[PDB]
Amino acid sequence: FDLENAVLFEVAWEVANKVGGIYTVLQTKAKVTGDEWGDNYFLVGPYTEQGVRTQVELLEAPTPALKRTLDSMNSKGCKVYFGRWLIEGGPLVVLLDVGASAWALERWKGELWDTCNIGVPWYDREANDAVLFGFLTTWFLGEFLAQSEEKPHVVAHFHEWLAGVGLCLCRARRLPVATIFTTHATLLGRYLCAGAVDFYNNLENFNVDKEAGERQIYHRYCMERAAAHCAHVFTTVSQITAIEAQHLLKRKPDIVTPNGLNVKKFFQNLHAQSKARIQEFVRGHFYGHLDFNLDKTLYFFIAGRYEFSNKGADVFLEALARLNYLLRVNGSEQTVVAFFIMPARTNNFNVETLKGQAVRKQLWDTANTVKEKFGRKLYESLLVGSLPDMNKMLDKEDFTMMKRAIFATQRQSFPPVCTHNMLDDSSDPILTTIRRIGLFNSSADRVKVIFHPEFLSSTSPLLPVDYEEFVRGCHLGVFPSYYEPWGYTPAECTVMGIPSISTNLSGFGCFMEEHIADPSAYGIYILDRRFRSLDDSCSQLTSFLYSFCQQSRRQRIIQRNRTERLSDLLDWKYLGRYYMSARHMALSKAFPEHFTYEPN
Template sequence: MPLARSLSVTSLSGLEEWDEEFDLEDAVLFEIAWEVANKVGGIYTVIQTKARLTAEEWGENYFLVGPYVESNVRTQVELIEPTNPVLKRTIDQMNASGCKIYFGRWLIEGSPYVVLIDVGFTAWSLDRWKRELWEHCGIGVPWFDREANDAVLFGFLTAWLLGEYAAQSEESPHIVAHFHEWLAGLGLVLCRQRQLPIATIFTTHATLLGRYLCAGSVDFYNNLAQVYIKFTDIITPNGLNVKKFSAMHEFQNLHAQSKSRIQEFVRGHFYGHLDFNLDKCLFLFIAGRYEFSNKGADVFLEALARLNYLLRVNHSDVTVIAFFIMPARTNNFNVETLKGQAVRKQLWDTAQTVKERFGKKLYESLLVGQLPDVSKMLDKEDFTIMKRAIFATQRQSQPPVCTHNMLEDSSDPILSCVRRIGLFNSSSDRVKIIFHPEFLSSTSPLLPMDYEEFVRGCHLGVFPSYYEPWGYTPAECTVMGIPSISTNLSGFGCFMEEHIADPSAYGIYILDRRYKGVDESCNQLTSFLFQFCKQSRRQRIIQRNRTERLSDLLDWRYLGRFYIAARHMALAKAFPDTFIYEPEETASTAGFRYPRPASVPPSPALSRHSSPHHSEAEDNEEDERYDEELEAEKDRVNIRQPYTMPVKNKVSAVLGANGDGEGDVNGDENGDGDEVTSEKN
């Protein structure tokens, strides 16, 4: 059987081979989400990066279903005729009945087929479908909620598509329908209500209930058992398509290039107050949707205030610049911020002008065979130009905290907290704050960098989230070799804590927000930041190498097997005569277990020297011999235990509900039987 038609995963080094294998010749997979070829949030990243692996497994029988958005289709989708005869008859029949369905290839890795539904074209059926939803399912939908109305239209059209496909098939196909989030979940409800012979999977990536309960300072996690209506069956971690560099130093070079661009922005932003050494400046950042407490911005700001105190009392020469990349309501760029970048460019032009004049005089002096008289190399005009440039850099006000004009400056949570802790970018502060209330773009006149370039240029990502079902931001940092701070309340943090013996040695710091209060968590975060500031440049380079080494653990080649297991469960429950799924029972999740790095001492490092005298190696760290390739190979080989597929009971599923998504695998053929649930770690 061709590899693309066999449901199996080949393990990489250190992992067991998965023995389960299903014949998928007669199986069809429809993956339904509102963010198919339509970027709204993190679900788009999940589906886009996972598409290549899924397309390799299912081949021509894998179809993504999403909304038709013309602006996105023009740049992301190649419209073609359906290659599947059953699907072609299905689309033709629906188009003849008053729908508008498009078929094409999504122009991403894997080039998966997409079925795009124009929900606006069938808006005339909205009232009728809302009434049907209330009469048959008891679900009421607000009349003037645009998002809910789109979900109703999309759900009914998706259920229509699946039912029509089953009806158009000459033989009874094994259909798997995988629904992502509530915007697509109505189709699953209708499939069950109509008793379609379909294996269904539902994945939730986050919930509004969870967001509001956590933001409302409710003791959410201790009362989670009372909130859960149903438990999940399997945790499905989110992965990324990891592209490894041929040489380990390449991503370090990218870090240096991006860091220099951030330094240029800092030179302009802090003009007139640039009294710190940029070579001893660390760039920290937090990014994501603007949820002040859920994303941990409150804890981060408090920890920065305490870090500033520690750096000052210890007379540290390290300066920390913390970036907050969170979109908020603004009306324009801050004039003072734009002026800073203009002054920086003017200074650069002035320096280039003086350099050319200096170089020309030096050249003329050398031509006649004389050493130049340094006192005559710069004339009065040169000094006048330089003095004007210096006077232009002087200003009385402090460098701005926010790069934009906020519409709600007085009530903004970040700015209000900055006023409380008193970090106003003064010269005496060792911690500076820059709030960029807009997503990064390479076309920005202020900080012309896209998000990936910016992350590569920073030294540490800080994500002390209180509600973070998975957390792509620290995962992206890991893949790019940038250390990060996460929490044991995030799916990513729990996953890394479970699969790495010593996460901090690899640059993955796990903040305890589950069993510690806010003040204790702030102190722990402050300790992490202060210890990071005390690292030498060479220590940070070694740590980045270790962090990048973990990228294999986040590759879809590993994590895709959890989705495969979910489809196994759904097929086995919907079609028990054809598919059998009996995973081994395990007490806990076993996985790709990284040990402590071989280059890390086996006992905690002491804060004092082991002898009263310094050695030459201690005085000159750069002379110490360190073979990073050899150390990396030791860490890869020394895997503590093989990988097995986890099966959690209901209690552990509740306690471990930190994943990016939770999936219901509804396997009853008649739509009213047992349900299997799954959860993302």
């Protein structure tokens, strides 16, 4: 438990190069781990030109023992650059370069085969990069111990299959370092889901070796599984990921370690301002098809990468069609606008969408011109001491201005379902379903779907809000997800006031079920897809969506306020306490004599 001399190396591929969500995990965790482990915190990561230029300030190797190791490695010709990552908490980052390719071509790869009976194929560059990185990381910590008299036992925390090669070698060279091995995702899991018909139910009845071999990911799988077996403490991001590991990597996670977000701030009501901005987009997009009260309108959104099956857009869409039917048959004044935002390939803003925003501008401009003129005439009339003469306030010019405006706000075509024009409209799974389900945003429809393919940005003319502000504006965030190991997008939404309908297959969903008895009051509805069929799950989502819709204004307010209590559940302080347990268990397993403080 105590770490008198222990030094933690959070070896990771995403130390100074943003490649995936793991980078956010490391960056956010850096602050809290920083406090606990002081200057013993040393993230090891691949050196990137971009990384050093914008993220890393190079530093003069302040531990003298470390300085010697850095120099020795540089003298041997391998390139290592010590520096301070400029992210919050100022973590010391030992960025080794993956440009030491000569050794890898024979020497590094050769050692691996004799040591672990494994190999990296010639074709795969990423694995080859990882073997280089792994050998260098093992060398660094081994050299660190050797060139530091009164050797401090270290706790290496390899965070992925890419860093996994190192863990195999550390144990194999029998170096006296405690080893954790978080799997932030299951390697085989991503390929098996979608690739196979029923991944999660057949999890138990999956031959890992067979699947990996078939997909030519066998080498990668072997490396990840070998790391699993090697690690003194094996941890996973979520309970769902744990189930994947148990039936694939064949090692039960010792601790269940959830990823977190630095909650921080995330005087002004973001919800109101953001809803206004969203409302203005809606007004513009509908271009005089505004037959529906926007006071009663609800906005639902699904974000994240454009994976139709994995991020479960299908469940949201099929469910929206069913919600449309329910709202129509019951004649509900409430209208749902479902703003799928999903980074996709688009040529430009669609003609209608751009024109729609322009007409909203024209109507607003006409309003301002007439309003100012009314302002002057009213002020003049009030000064005289007479109440305004209605029907005399507006001049003939003002009628021509407004008549042009009313002429502008006329359309016969139903308002567009996709704000950016698609490179391939037929191909888009979201758009194909929007057609099939029967959502063309007709006047009659109570559910209108607005698919915004571009990642939302402040610069864009339509919906000027940044992703943060758009999330804050929306009433509900529907994120049903088949494979999500940890729901980064759902987690962000929950940390923001927004109630979010996540799933039992999502890491965030599993986390919420475990930590909240009564989810629905607290906003985090958990659609179950692990014990259900696809259609029954859709019906379950429809029920959830309908329940949210059929809520009083007051009830919704309560729900949001409840969700703001659940920020603490997903704060790094508490989730780092989960990681601290992993480290303490690792320290105890590796050196029982040195440290034996592992109660529960």
